[PDB]
Amino acid sequence: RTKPDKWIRDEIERLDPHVDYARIWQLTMTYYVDDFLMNLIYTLGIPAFTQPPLGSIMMGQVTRKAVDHGQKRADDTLQHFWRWFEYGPADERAQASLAQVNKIHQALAKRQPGTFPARDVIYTSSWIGVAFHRLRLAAGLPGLSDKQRIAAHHFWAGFGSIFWSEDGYVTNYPDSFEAMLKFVEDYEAEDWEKVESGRILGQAINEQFYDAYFPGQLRALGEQLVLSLQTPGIRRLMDMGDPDPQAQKIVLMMLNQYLTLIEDVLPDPELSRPERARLEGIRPPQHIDPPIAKILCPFK
Amino acid sequence: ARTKPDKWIRDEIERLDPHVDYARIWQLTMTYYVDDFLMNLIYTLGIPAFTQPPLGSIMMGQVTRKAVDHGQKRADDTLQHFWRWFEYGPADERAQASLAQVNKIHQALAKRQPGTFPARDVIYTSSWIGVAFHRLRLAAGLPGLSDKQRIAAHHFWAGFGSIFWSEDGYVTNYPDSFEAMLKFVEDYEAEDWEKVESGRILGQAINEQFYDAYFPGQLRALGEQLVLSLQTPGIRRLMDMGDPDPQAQKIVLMMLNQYLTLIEDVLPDPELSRPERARLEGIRPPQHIDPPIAKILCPFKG
Ligand code: HEM
Ligand code: HEM
Ligand SMILES: [Cl-]
Ligand SMILES: [Cl-]
Numbered sequence: 001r002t003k004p005d006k007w008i009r010d011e012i013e014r015l016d017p018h019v020d021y022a023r024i025w026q027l028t029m030t031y032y033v034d035d036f037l038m039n040l041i042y043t044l045g046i047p048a049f050t051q052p053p054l055g056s057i058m059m060g061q062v063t064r065k066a067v068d069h070g071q072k073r074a075d076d077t078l079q080h081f082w083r084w085f086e087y088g089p090a091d092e093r094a095q096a097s098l099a100q101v102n103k104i105h106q107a108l109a110k111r112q113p114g115t116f117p118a119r120d121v122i123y124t125s126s127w128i129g130v131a132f133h134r135l136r137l138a139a140g141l142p143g144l145s146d147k148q149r150i151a152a153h154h155f156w157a158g159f160g161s162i163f164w165s166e167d168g169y170v171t172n173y174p175d176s177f178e179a180m181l182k183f184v185e186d187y188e189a190e191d192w193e194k195v196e197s198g199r200i201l202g203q204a205i206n207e208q209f210y211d212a213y214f215p216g217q218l219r220a221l222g223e224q225l226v227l228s229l230q231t232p233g234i235r236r237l238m239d240m241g242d243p244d245p246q247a248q249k250i251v252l253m254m255l256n257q258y259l260t261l262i263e264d265v266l267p268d269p270e271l272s273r274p275e276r277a278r279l280e281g282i283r284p285p286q287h288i289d290p291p292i293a294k295i296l297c298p299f300k
Numbered sequence: 301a302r303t304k305p306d307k308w309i310r311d312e313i314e315r316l317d318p319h320v321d322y323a324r325i326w327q328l329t330m331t332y333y334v335d336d337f338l339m340n341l342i343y344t345l346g347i348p349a350f351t352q353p354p355l356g357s358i359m360m361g362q363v364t365r366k367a368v369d370h371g372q373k374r375a376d377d378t379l380q381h382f383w384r385w386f387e388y389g390p391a392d393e394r395a396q397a398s399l400a401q402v403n404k405i406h407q408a409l410a411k412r413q414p415g416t417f418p419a420r421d422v423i424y425t426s427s428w429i430g431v432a433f434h435r436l437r438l439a440a441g442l443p444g445l446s447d448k449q450r451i452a453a454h455h456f457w458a459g460f461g462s463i464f465w466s467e468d469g470y471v472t473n474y475p476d477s478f479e480a481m482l483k484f485v486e487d488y489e490a491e492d493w494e495k496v497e498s499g500r501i502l503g504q505a506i507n508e509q510f511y512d513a514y515f516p517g518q519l520r521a522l523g524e525q526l527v528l529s530l531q532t533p534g535i536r537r538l539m540d541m542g543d544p545d546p547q548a549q550k551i552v553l554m555m556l557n558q559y560l561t562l563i564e565d566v567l568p569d570p571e572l573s574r575p576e577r578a579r580l581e582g583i584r585p586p587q588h589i590d591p592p593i594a595k596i597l598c599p600f601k602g
């Protein structure tokens with residue numbers, strides 16, 4: 001062992017959340033978090049991101065990638081997310097990945113105008129920046145600490161500034177973590193039109209998670225986990241159904257206990273998950289190097 | 301298309317006669333709610349128990365080396381037999397022909413190293429398996445096997461005993477009840493077994509197979525707490541496994557309690573046993589490949 005059994009909490013406490021926001025987000029989102037939890041977040045996220053009809057149409061009907069190749073879509077998305085999370089928006093390795101995502105979105109926008117308003121870039125990024133926070137609160141665990149919240153804000157405000165939308169690069173971002181939460185909650189309270197494309201996509205997204213981590217007879221358990229964590233508003237909008245009240249209390253407690261065990265009790269990891277992944281003989285699919293492009297709009 | 305009611309397994313046991321239908325009751329106890337993960341957990345807890353006698357850890361760890369050098373294959377190969385026995389029971393030719401193969405294996409091993417397969421150890425090992433889920437449940441704060449499950453488990457393993465070869469002959473004189481099986485297991489585990497390096501080496505390779513299969517990379521620590529929380533204090537000391545972190549132990553035992561509660565009491569019962577489910581998959585899962593068999597020499601009588 002190179003490090004003390006407990007060092008992550010302490011190292012965050014030592015850092016400045018206004019300067020070291022990249023490092024704090026990395027410590028928050030890439031050490032205790034593994035491929036399973038990161039997949040859980042993506043699974044909860046895509047149906048949130050696609051509350052606008054044009055988004056569920058785009059993914060579910062137009063490209064079909066989530067429906068016909070759900071596993072590849074999940075792996076492809078996460079290759080980018082892990083890279084961003086490891087290095088942050090000031091780093092060229094993350095920026096060149098984002099440049100590729102911007103190029104993808106730009107071509108999609110020509111196929112279907114109105115799919116990429118800045119509103120949705122703010123929402124999606126804000127969702128991700130508060131995701132683990134909200135998941136923890138749903139499981140009865142404490143929210144992110146003061147420094148984690150401030151860092152998460154600066155991290156996502158930073159990525160916002162280099163994130164393309166049909167309204168241009170996202171210059172005017174929520175002002176604080178609390179402002180990100182309120183944006184996400186306000187957006188989720190909007191009167192989105194309910195559409196069959198949303199149901200179809202939500203189901204394909206859910207099934208990817210089940211197929212990866214809860215195969216065969218385990219499906220039912222995995223379903224309770226997702227339906228226990230997905231917001232009531234998004235479940236209704238996408239016809240996902242509702243958790244069994246008894247199962248929900250149990251699965252949330254099990255998630256609570258697992259996170260408690262790895263955070264408070266068992267030794268902290270010495271390396272981030274991406275680092276661990278790059279030591280494996282075969283590169284795990286979520287940790288393959290994302291495709292990159294020319295950096296057009298550099299971080300300021 | 302649900303074919304069965306959400307809850308039918310408990311009720312089916314309740315309708316059965318544990319003195320006649322013991323094979324079916326054991327099947328309902330050990331092959332529906334149990335999956336490959338839990339079955340692997342039972343194997344992992346079992347081998348170091350079975351090898352408390354030095355000659356057993358020597359045989360597996362030094363002589364054949366299979367559990368040390370090919371742990372995953374050993375686990376799969378053992379469980380192919382266990383699932384088959386559990387699905388059909390000792391009165392069934394399919395299980396008998398598998399056991400005949402295991403008897404042949406043990407017979408050749410016993411010639412290589414006499415004293416490795418006394419009736420004592422066949423009784424202990426089979427009794428350990430017959431009370432394994434019972435003890436695991438009690439360790440996790442759940443109720444033990446029900447009246448009929450206990451009776452059936454006894455008859456099941458008494459039956460297998462009668463066709464199980466040992467160096468003292470086929471095991472005719474078996475513990476007389478579930479309670480007697482539990483006391484035999486407890487008495488054996490209280491014995492003053494000689495502590496030997498072969499035991500440490502084997503116990504650690506057994507543990508590592510489980511970690512490698514279900515708790516890879518950073519998950520290992522969690523997997524270790526699970527095993528060390530369930531393994532008996534006596535066997536941990538004997539095999540230098542160490543002791544669980546008291547905080548982690550309480551957490552992992554509650555998580556196991558809750559998972560079993562969820563699948564048993566809350567979520568719909570499975571419609572098919574795990575072997576049945578397994579035989580529907582495009583590729584046969586390794587635990588559920590049909591075991592190697594031999595000619596039935598000593599047929600079940602009862
Ligand atoms: C909100 C509206 C958005 C829509 C409708 C959308 C849709 C898509 C589509 C259609 C793809 C191509 C793969 C496919 O056919 O499914 C894609 C790729 C991607 N998007 Fe978005 N996106 C949106 C916003 C965002 C945001 C805000 C992020 C990140 C913060 C993001 C991250 C990605 C990544 C990393 C990929 C690459 C995945 C792959 O190559 O399959 N998207 N998106
Ligand atoms: C009492 C001491 C026992 C010892 C030392 C022992 C040892 C062994 C050995 C060495 C093998 C061959 C595979 C290897 O190289 O590891 C084997 C096979 C097997 N034994 Fe035993 N055994 C014992 C008792 C039992 C009992 C009581 C059962 C079941 C109730 C059992 C079930 C099996 C099965 C299913 C196999 C086949 C696994 C394979 O082919 O890899 N053993 N045993
Ligand atoms: Cl953070
Ligand atoms: Cl299954």
Ligand SMILES: [Cl-]
Nearest residue numbers: 276516517518
């Ligand atoms: Cl890892």
